Design a protein around this motif. Structure first.
Motif, PDB file in Angstrom:
ATOM      1  N   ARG A 249       0.686  -1.219   0.158  1.00 35.91           N
ATOM      2  CA  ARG A 249      -0.074  -0.084   0.033  1.00 35.91           C
ATOM      3  C   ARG A 249       0.833   1.346   0.111  1.00 35.91           C
ATOM      4  NH1 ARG A 249      -5.378  -0.938  -1.373  1.00 35.91           N
ATOM      5  NH2 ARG A 249      -6.306  -2.325   0.017  1.00 35.91           N
TER       6      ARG A 249
ATOM      7  N   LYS B  25     -12.832   5.255   7.631  1.00 37.41           N
ATOM      8  CA  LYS B  25     -12.447   6.395   6.362  1.00 37.41           C
ATOM      9  C   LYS B  25     -12.473   7.434   7.091  1.00 37.41           C
ATOM     10  CE  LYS B  25     -14.603   3.694   2.457  1.00 37.41           C
ATOM     11  NZ  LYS B  25     -15.477   3.732   1.177  1.00 37.41           N
TER      12      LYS B  25
ATOM     13  N   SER C 179     -12.666  11.231   6.143  1.00 40.02           N
ATOM     14  CA  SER C 179     -12.719  12.395   5.099  1.00 40.02           C
ATOM     15  C   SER C 179     -12.576  13.663   5.592  1.00 40.02           C
ATOM     16  CB  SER C 179     -14.235  11.906   4.742  1.00 40.02           C
ATOM     17  OG  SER C 179     -14.470  10.501   4.368  1.00 40.02           O
TER      18      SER C 179
ATOM     19  N   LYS D 198      -3.319   3.634   2.961  1.00 34.99           N
ATOM     20  CA  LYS D 198      -4.528   2.597   3.072  1.00 34.99           C
ATOM     21  C   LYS D 198      -4.151   1.502   3.922  1.00 34.99           C
ATOM     22  CE  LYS D 198      -6.802   3.692  -1.333  1.00 34.99           C
ATOM     23  NZ  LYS D 198      -7.615   3.141  -2.496  1.00 34.99           N
TER      24      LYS D 198
ATOM     25  N   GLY E 225      -5.058  -5.182   2.633  1.00 35.94           N
ATOM     26  CA  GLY E 225      -6.059  -5.914   2.365  1.00 35.94           C
ATOM     27  C   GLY E 225      -7.380  -5.119   2.280  1.00 35.94           C
ATOM     28  N   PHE E 226      -8.539  -6.001   2.362  1.00 28.93           N
ATOM     29  CA  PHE E 226      -9.829  -5.523   2.490  1.00 28.93           C
ATOM     30  C   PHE E 226     -10.942  -6.528   3.348  1.00 28.93           C
ATOM     31  CE2 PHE E 226     -12.365  -8.058  -0.381  1.00 28.93           C
ATOM     32  CZ  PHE E 226     -11.310  -8.800  -0.893  1.00 28.93           C
ATOM     33  N   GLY E 227     -12.053  -6.029   3.799  1.00 29.31           N
ATOM     34  CA  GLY E 227     -13.029  -6.744   4.519  1.00 29.31           C
ATOM     35  C   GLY E 227     -12.592  -7.200   5.785  1.00 29.31           C
ATOM     36  N   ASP E 228     -12.840  -8.359   6.279  1.00 31.25           N
ATOM     37  CA  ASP E 228     -12.448  -8.764   7.431  1.00 31.25           C
ATOM     38  C   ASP E 228     -10.719  -8.880   7.924  1.00 31.25           C
ATOM     39  OD1 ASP E 228     -15.117  -9.116   7.641  1.00 31.25           O
ATOM     40  OD2 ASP E 228     -15.293 -11.262   7.573  1.00 31.25           O
TER      41      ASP E 228
ATOM     42  N   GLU F   5     -14.818   2.285  14.769  1.00 34.64           N
ATOM     43  CA  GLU F   5     -15.931   2.887  14.955  1.00 34.64           C
ATOM     44  C   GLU F   5     -16.754   1.853  15.691  1.00 34.64           C
ATOM     45  OE1 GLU F   5     -17.683   4.768  11.506  1.00 34.64           O
ATOM     46  OE2 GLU F   5     -17.095   6.797  12.479  1.00 34.64           O
TER      47      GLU F   5
ATOM     48  N   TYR G 248      -7.570 -21.486   1.425  1.00 31.81           N
ATOM     49  CA  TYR G 248      -7.389 -19.992   1.135  1.00 31.81           C
ATOM     50  C   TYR G 248      -7.056 -19.381   2.534  1.00 31.81           C
ATOM     51  CZ  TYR G 248      -8.611 -15.178   0.001  1.00 31.81           C
ATOM     52  OH  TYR G 248      -8.376 -13.648  -0.302  1.00 31.81           O
TER      53      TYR G 248
ATOM     54  N   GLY H 210     -17.704  -6.323  -0.913  1.00 35.42           N
ATOM     55  CA  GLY H 210     -17.467  -7.270  -0.163  1.00 35.42           C
ATOM     56  C   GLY H 210     -16.748  -7.186   1.181  1.00 35.42           C
ATOM     57  N   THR H 211     -16.731  -8.256   2.002  1.00 30.89           N
ATOM     58  CA  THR H 211     -15.912  -8.293   3.079  1.00 30.89           C
ATOM     59  C   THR H 211     -14.799  -9.552   3.308  1.00 30.89           C
ATOM     60  OG1 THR H 211     -17.384  -9.415   4.568  1.00 30.89           O
ATOM     61  CG2 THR H 211     -17.525  -7.083   4.636  1.00 30.89           C
ATOM     62  N   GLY H 212     -14.820 -10.205   1.929  1.00 28.52           N
ATOM     63  CA  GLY H 212     -14.024 -11.241   2.025  1.00 28.52           C
ATOM     64  C   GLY H 212     -13.850 -11.876   0.572  1.00 28.52           C
ATOM     65  N   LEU H 213     -13.574 -13.225   0.559  1.00 28.53           N
ATOM     66  CA  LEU H 213     -13.605 -14.096  -0.836  1.00 28.53           C
ATOM     67  C   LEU H 213     -14.930 -14.474  -1.290  1.00 28.53           C
ATOM     68  CD1 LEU H 213     -11.199 -16.023  -2.173  1.00 28.53           C
ATOM     69  CD2 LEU H 213     -12.937 -17.418  -1.457  1.00 28.53           C
TER      70      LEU H 213
ATOM     71  N   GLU I 265     -21.958   7.085   3.587  1.00 22.96           N
ATOM     72  CA  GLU I 265     -21.996   5.811   4.339  1.00 22.96           C
ATOM     73  C   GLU I 265     -22.409   6.267   5.858  1.00 22.96           C
ATOM     74  OE1 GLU I 265     -17.928   4.544   4.039  1.00 22.96           O
ATOM     75  OE2 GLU I 265     -18.623   3.079   2.751  1.00 22.96           O
TER      76      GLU I 265
ATOM     77  N   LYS J  21     -20.632  16.813   4.734  1.00 24.19           N
ATOM     78  CA  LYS J  21     -21.106  16.050   3.705  1.00 24.19           C
ATOM     79  C   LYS J  21     -22.589  15.970   3.829  1.00 24.19           C
ATOM     80  CE  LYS J  21     -17.132  15.048   1.542  1.00 24.19           C
ATOM     81  NZ  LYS J  21     -16.012  14.390   2.327  1.00 24.19           N
TER      82      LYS J  21
ATOM     83  N   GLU K 170      -8.464  -6.980  -3.818  1.00 22.67           N
ATOM     84  CA  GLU K 170      -9.200  -5.767  -3.788  1.00 22.67           C
ATOM     85  C   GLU K 170      -9.480  -5.309  -5.377  1.00 22.67           C
ATOM     86  OE1 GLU K 170      -7.728  -2.140  -2.200  1.00 22.67           O
ATOM     87  OE2 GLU K 170      -9.737  -1.512  -1.467  1.00 22.67           O
TER      88      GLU K 170
ATOM     89  N   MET L 268     -12.240  -7.624  -6.792  1.00 22.05           N
ATOM     90  CA  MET L 268     -13.398  -7.281  -6.138  1.00 22.05           C
ATOM     91  C   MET L 268     -14.134  -6.079  -6.897  1.00 22.05           C
ATOM     92  SD  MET L 268     -14.978  -5.274  -3.419  1.00 22.05           S
ATOM     93  CE  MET L 268     -13.552  -4.477  -2.527  1.00 22.05           C
TER      94      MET L 268
END
Lengths: 524, 524, 524, 113
Positions: A196, A225, A227, A276, A279-282, A302, A359, B179-182, B215, B271, B385, B388
């Motif tokens: 990243r 996030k 902002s 950033k 990764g992403f998600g969980d 949050e 995975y 999504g939050t994963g695979l 959001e 916002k 990502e 995704m």
């Protein structure tokens, strides 16, 4: 605003003109007999250089359509440099060659879509033939040899890299720092690296490498996030008191928060960098906690009910140094305790045993490898400061080339690997005659890097290119000594990754320009 | 200011010149062998794209009259995209074809009013013939097939859409999220959608889709016209403290209130997004209370005696996410209690029984369907990502195409449905010879999309168009494989709604331009 | 010399421009309310005229391509005048109308070859419909009425022509001469006429009629091609002594003989005129002997062994007067003896009895009819010389119109016959739509002569044209009195031959120009 | 067969004709494509699409072709539309002769204007 719109041939000749100005300016620096390029500056004396990356960066044309041409090829050429650590110049001359003969074939009346498909097939075949020619770089003897060659025949640099990779592994993290004396050093520390990069170019304080470098920074960790900068005010003011820089690792930093930070850092009120979370998600929330344990801080999410307004210096993690590339962030020597880090490794290592899916198992192994693996820190020593800086540069460049060699091996240098591969694909054909022309355009273009190197030496490119094609294997023309022979034995080699990347990225943009029928830009 | 006024032929050739520049720039991207268009930017490298919507957006001409020409066709072409989710490119090439031959026939000496009436009669007939050719898309097997084709032969996307529509119904609300994963997910939540878009383009923070996305926003509900921002100050400052965005659902937001909000959001202080309340009159006040119960807030009306100055965060409703198009607003996962929502459904469901009128009954059924129906939330999963985001895009586009297919079925793609229909109307005549010419102008124009696709392939349009006309039904030319056959079986199809909308909107503006005798604009 | 070459539309608009300048200049003179045209001269005062033939003659344009346009239409328009004695103006306005709407339809995109075929079919149909409308002119009462109308309501002229045709027959030869007093005369004399005009325009000494007129001339008769004037020297010098003009009737007069005679006559040394002998082959030699017996001379043939060098004044035939048009020669009052002429008639009349073939019989009947029939000589008398010349002009013009009326009857004048015919062909169609347009172009063009006449009166052409079309038969608009009614009863009529010829010749050139794709001319 | 169909008929039969190298192969295809020009021009003057007619004639065999006068397909010899073999042969050979000379021309000399 009102636009200038050009079509077909009228538009293609504009792009060709543009890429010629870029390519011709950059390609004079190619090879050991490369020529100098003088880059002007508003203040002081001009910069004389043989660096195609530095030359390319400056190129911007007045004609809007011609500029677009140059800026297109310049973008993809730099991706080859980001990926493999080298090959901007090589990619630019390859792009020019494919484009020149490609756009000629379009004016001929041939189908641009078939020309592109023929080029791509020739490249796909060339890359496979390039892998066959590739000599592996496995053992630490070969790793030293590649590092030595990359550092201009300095065996001390190859020794340093070989020892560094022996400590943390081949795929492990290695960083170069300024030395504290004459003798070199090598230390393994608690650290991590993740894919990243910086969120804005204006955080860069080291324009040579083009990377952000912060010494003894605080590290904010937030699963959110960001902002607005209104939430950051109590944190940023607390950081400013201690007199240290800051690293923002959040889900994202958008709009006003990013814009205000860029202005504050650029003016020089408080040093900050934004990236950033990995990764992403969980798994993003899992990897954020890995950094928190490593750096010895706390995650501000949050979900649990923690706000950035109520954050204090104790919640912020800390390390000794951090480095941030266009698409990489590295954390060096984290303050986090050994009990907490080893405890976190024990948790994730138990989850590998409980993992039902493959995975799920593979990603858990990546998290422990990053955390428990650590970071090697090479400190380059020298007698004087001028020698220390010059040597450090050669170590970093050799480290980039050595990594690429370890990944995909090495091939013969001086542009002979491309012409060798091209000679083997003489029988390669396509589905129709336009595709056949596309193939030959690509195979003829692969001679351009060598032909250019030979031209800078002052010798006839046709004669040398013809002689190299006549031979087999790693036989080629040594541009430095102006003698023929085995290029690998003579110590002139490129990592297979840089030659491959240069060819693929050059062919990519050439394919796009060949298949372009319209251009839109603002009026002058 | 002083004006430039042009008349008749002098004015028509200016519009023709303008729409040609737009059409020619956009139509090169049409078909599977579509060409690239390079769009310049002030900062950074140019954008290479095959998206006719992105290309069209950039087109603005220097000549005031020519620009008007292009901006006219461009507006109606985008309405086809808003209505059916696709067909901007197709509508632009159709418009060009009708206009070119239409304006030629006007210069010939023929009556513009009769030419228009002949075109309209041909289109009306074509749309009916297009419905006959249309294959329905009823069962969930067919829904999966259409979604699969729309997502570039990805069966996982068709599976997701089919399952989503199976949950909330065919006409139900479906939304796509990160999504939050695979693995993918699908959840039904308390939500609502209504046909009221954003009040100003500058609220858009997602320029790709061209929609507002907030959001965890607060939702202000007011049964009143908010003209002044002085009343909003205590609310906006209360929202700013919690660090969350805001959604204004009022009767209207005009003048100073709208202008000040646009400046505050664009700079990035707080916002906010503003939208009109759904419906009008008495039912508007009823539907505002549906949102209040759904989101778990309170309506602030002048009638009862409640002011915006005295409003607090507790009165404001809340949800997890909201999406706002040019003419749509969606509320996803409302905070409102299940007891209150189910109670509100029981009230309106009893009013259906007490309803004396049919119209009163039908509108009450719409309110319960929106409220009790809920919203499906597809969460697109992937390994990385980049995958995704790329997959999520294909899901959204496939979801738009699938909706349109469910409404009006599907017809043969690659522009063959239009030429098939056109061949069936050879005997169609009008009241006089000028109308007969108008009909033939329209029928000849329906060949343009196919002819353009064939031209981009590098084949002769006349030869292919002639062969397709010779056949019957869904027989056509597959532009991807360059083979003839049944287009529906080969998996090349458009929703009947996009082909219909594209033709009707193209013919609409062409009719207006043909019947234009004067143009007024500012001097250069 | 180097050429200027233009193609297609670029070439057609040049011709259109050219024919417009000719047509607009000529068409102002059309009708009884026709306007004046002032034609400049290098010496003296300008010529004011309402004669479309005189105006047309002067028209020559600077632009080479435009000139070609005008000179094309001007040539075929004069052929209508040569054939029927009238209709140059009418043919020019008809040509303009067909060309204007024709070339417009070519720019439309319609097929020029189909447009021409449609025009021709409409004309062919129109000519047949024109013959149905035609009222015959058989008896001598009707012949007087037509002559009276043609001579501006002078019953004395109609009386003269009727009596003249009663003497020598309807198809017989009639000539007009200057009178010798107040009272008119009518005498039949030994004479002949044959269809062979002058060999060069520079023999013309009467530019008003545009014909050669020699008083008391000698007549040389030679069955041979006279290429050299060296052979003529003894004859020409013998003629010059007596002080009389000469008529050369040979097989042909080519090159140096013709060129030298033109120079000698134009300077005014010896008056001479050259014409081809009538017919060809064997019958040419027979008809040459008819002239020799009629004029009282001798034939000089190479076959028998007679040379032009050895010819004398006795061998030359003689008459009182001769007239030579563009394509006609007339011999009036031959010196030949009555015994010889009547003897020659007896010989040929016996050959009619011995004739085995019909074609042989028919041609022998033509030779006796010419010889034994003779020539009527009208001598126009008046009080003064100015009245005699003015009356003589009206007699000649009335004689031309009467001839044409006797051949093909008469139709309604003032351009109503064309519009009447055009209204009857509303249902006329062709093989395809382009031909249908070609038909309507021709039918719309047939209104142009009337519409022009009405425009010169100062009335609205649309209103009058619409009213005439509403009626039937010979109902039309009297342009002189500005009242509607039966045109034949009102005494406004054209010979069917002039209206027919004007339409056919106009349509001929219009068809050629419509189907023209290239023009070649010298550079300016 | 007349109306330029003899040339296009012959051209369709030589699709497999090749030379010693790729430049010669292009030269062959240039000539074979050029043999369609007379027919394509005739069809263009009729107002019909040359590509469509040329494609239909190539699909057939023998003396099958497009009658430009009647605008109907059929046997050209039976329909009475034919050229002497000598004129078609001579036209092709003389056209190819000068085209070969111009293609292989590298310099031109003339008087100044």
């Amino acid at each position: 605003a009102a636009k200038d719109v050009k079509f077909g041939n009228d538009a293609r000749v504009k792009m060709l003109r543009g890429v010629n100005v870029l390519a011709d300016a950059v390609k004079v620096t190619l090879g050991p007999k490369g020529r100098n390029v003088v880059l002007d500056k508003s203040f002081g004396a001009p910069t004389i250089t043989k660096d195609g990356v530095s030359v390319a960066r400056e190129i911007e044309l007045e004609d809007k359509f011609e500029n677009m041409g140059a800026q297109m090829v310049k973008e993809v050429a730099s991706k080859a440099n980001d990926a493999a650590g080298d090959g901007t110049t090589t990619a630019t001359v390859l792009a020019q060659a494919i484009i020149t003969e490609g756009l000629k074939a379009v004016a001929c009346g041939m189908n641009p879509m078939d020309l592109k498909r023929g080029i791509d097939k020739a490249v796909t075949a060339a890359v496979e033939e390039l892998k066959a020619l590739s000599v592996p770089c496995s053992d630490s003897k070969a790793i030293a040899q590649v590092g030595t060659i990359s550092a201009n025949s300095d065996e001390t640099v190859g020794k340093l890299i070989a020892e560094a990779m022996d400590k943390v592994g081949k795929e492990g993290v290695i960083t170069v720092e300024d030395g504290t004396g004459l003798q070199d050093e090598l230390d393994v520390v608690e650290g991590m690296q993740f894919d990243r990069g910086y969120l804005s170019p204006y955080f860069i304080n080291k324009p040579e490498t083009g990377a952000v470098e912060l010494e003894s920074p605080f590290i904010l960790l937030a699963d959110k996030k960001i902002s607005n900068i209104r939430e950051m005010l109590p944190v940023l003011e607390a950081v400013a008191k201690a007199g240290k820089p800051l690293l923002i690792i959040a889900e994202d930093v958008e709009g006003e928060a990013l814009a205000t930070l860029v202005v504050n850092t650029m003016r020089g009120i408080v040093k900050v960098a934004a990236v950033k979370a990995p990764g992403f998600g969980d798994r993003r929330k899992a990897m954020l906690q890995d950094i928190a344990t490593l750096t010895g801080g706390t995650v501000i999410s949050e979900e649990i009910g923690m706000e950035l307004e109520k954050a204090t210096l104790e919640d912020l993690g800390q390390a000794k140094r951090v480095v941030i590339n266009k698409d990489t962030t590295t954390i060096i020597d984290g303050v986090g305790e050994e009990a907490a880090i080893q405890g976190r490794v024990a948790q994730i290592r138990q989850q590998i045993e409980e993992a039902t899916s493959d995975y799920d198992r593979e990603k858990l192994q990546e998290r422990v490898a990053k955390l428990a693996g650590g970071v090697a820190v090479i400190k380059v020593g020298a007698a004087t400061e001028v020698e220390m800086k010059e040597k450090k540069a050669r170590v970093e460049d050799a480290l980039h080339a050595t990594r690429a060699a370890v990944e995909e091996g090495v091939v013969a240098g001086g542009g002979v690997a491309l012409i060798r591969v091209a000679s083997k694909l003489a029988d390669l054909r396509g589905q129709n005659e336009d595709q056949n022309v596309g193939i030959k355009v690509a195979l003829r273009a692969m001679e351009a890097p060598l032909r250019q190197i030979v031209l800078n030496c002052g010798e006839e490119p046709s004669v040398v290119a013809n002689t190299v094609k006549g031979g087999d294997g790693n036989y080629g023309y040594n541009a430095a000594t102006e003698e023929y022979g085995n290029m690998i034995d003579m110590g002139i080699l490129d990592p297979t990754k840089v030659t491959r990347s240069a060819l693929q990225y050059a062919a990519s943009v050439a394919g796009l320009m060949i298949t372009t029928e319209c251009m839109v830009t603002d009026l002058p």
